[PDB]
């Protein structure tokens with residue numbers, strides 16, 4: 058039950074909001090975590106989602122990692138959403154602070170296309186060091202399902218929208 062979003066394209070929507078609070082008001086089927094390949098949930102969206110599950114995401118993640126080994130950059134896995142959503146799509150964007158290839162951002166957003174509807178942040182745009190505006194551009198050009206983007210910083214939201222109008 059997404060409310061209050063700005064329509065950017067027929068399938069990309071954006072709202073100035075914290076992703077953990079949206080998950081609670083909207084009860085989404087798929088919340089996207091911006092993850093790293095070991096599902097070690099640090100200080101961004103991944104930390105906040107984990108906090109709200111009372112660390113259940115981290116245990117489940119380690120269990121997944123123990124069985125299956127780490128993800129590839131640009132990949133994903135479908136774990137549980139616990140009290141936030143039905144499912145959590147863990148997606149690993151490139152970490153440009155660690156020399157990974159920004160082109161893999163396209164591979165990262167392609168995982169979204171296996172889900173009809175998702176609530177997501179902007180992959181790689183915080184701790185991983187990609188430009189938010191670039192991340193939004195790849196999102197817009199790669200994702201074909203319905204993606205609802207949560208941008209918690211009001212100034213970044215304004216910047217992002219203004220950047221998108223250079224269409």
Ligand SMILES: Nc1ncnc2c1ncn2[C@@H]1O[C@H](COP(=O)(O)OP(=O)(O)OC[C@H]2O[C@@H](O)[C@H](O)[C@@H]2O)[C@@H](O)[C@H]1O
Pocket residue numbers: 074075076077091092093096097098099100101102103104105150178179180181182183184185186187189207208209
């Ligand atoms: N609670 C939040 N709600 C909405 N957007 C948020 C929130 N916290 C951060 N963001 C925004 O989401 C985008 C992604 O930030 P990160 O979560 O740091 O994502 P990423 O750059 O992919 O970092 C991946 C890394 O962060 C760790 O938490 C994670 O375990 C991995 O090591 C950025 O614009 C950031 O400002």
